[PDB]
Design a protein around this ligand. Structure first.
Ligand SMILES: COc1ccc2nc(C)c(O[C@@H]3C[C@H]4C(=O)N[C@]5(C(=O)NS(=O)(=O)C6(C)CC6)C[C@H]5/C=C\CCCCC[C@H](NC(=O)OC5CC(F)(F)C5)C(=O)N4C3)nc2c1
Ligand SMILES: [Zn+2]
Length: 198
């Protein structure tokens, strides 16, 4: 019935990948209970830091990456959802289901990566567990893992960054190419698609 139709909650920042120092490690900033509450209200007073956020809905968890003042993530994680923020839910600034890409204004306190201009093919994928995985670029939107891994190790890292040697954003992790459950290559949204959308 119309009176009973419910609302999907907002995406919620529940942690971050710390790349500040010499060692990368994940930090959680909100537990499940607070996450559920924050997703319903859309009101998130937590301080935000860093470039790579860990984000969750009521049913999924993935990553979000700030590039040039926009917090980017994948449509198959976020859908058309708002993101929780100190002033309430924030509507998506970008939505492209054809690229599996969405974006919101980057939260106050976040740091943005700058798009890569090096043209280098030696990349590094950052996972939700703060693993930094060497990836060789194989195409506009493909890269091969130098050391293959079960897909289990990549699950939940969509929306994370592929970086160049200089630490620039090369793309947003979108999908894993696997055979027999072993991930051999990754599919990603090139940063140029982002720069075009912007
Ligand atoms: C509904 O609207 C839309 C619109 C456009 C969409 N466009 C894409 C490409 C897509 O793909 C889905 C989701 C994605 C995925 O699971 N992404 C990662 C992830 O972690 N998600 S996640 O965080 O856990 C989660 C669900 C958000 C919470 C990183 C991968 C890690 C492990 C996956 C293993 C099993 C899956 C292997 C699979 N493989 C593959 O499809 O490869 C091919 C794409 C190609 F290049 F053509 C070849 C794969 O990767 N996906 C399947 N859904 C779309 C949906
Ligand atoms: Zn670069």
């Amino acid at each position: 019935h119309m009176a009973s139709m419910k609302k999907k909650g907002s995406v919620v920042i529940v942690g971050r990948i710390n790349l500040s120092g010499d060692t990368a490690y994940a930090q959680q900033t909100r537990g499940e209970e607070g996450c559920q509450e924050t997703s319903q209200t859309g009101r998130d007073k937590n301080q935000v830091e860093g470039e790579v956020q860990i984000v969750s809905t009521a049913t999924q968890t993935f990553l979000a990456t700030s590039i040039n003042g926009v917090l980017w993530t994948v449509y198959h994680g976020a859908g058309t959802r708002t993101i929780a923020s100190p002033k309430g839910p924030v509507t998506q600034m970008y939505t492209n289901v054809d690229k599996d890409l969405v974006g919101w204004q980057a939260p106050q306190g976040s740091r943005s990566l700058t798009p890569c201009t090096c043209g280098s093919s030696d990349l590094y994928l950052v996972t939700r567990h703060a693993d930094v995985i060497p990836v060789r670029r194989r195409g506009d939107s493909r890269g091969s893992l130098l050391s293959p891994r079960p897909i289990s190790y990549l699950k939940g890292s969509s929306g994370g960054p592929l970086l160049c040697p200089a630490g620039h954003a090369v793309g947003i992790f979108r999908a894993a190419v696997s055979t027999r459950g072993v991930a051999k290559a990754v599919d990603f949204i090139p940063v140029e698609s982002l720069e075009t959308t912007m």
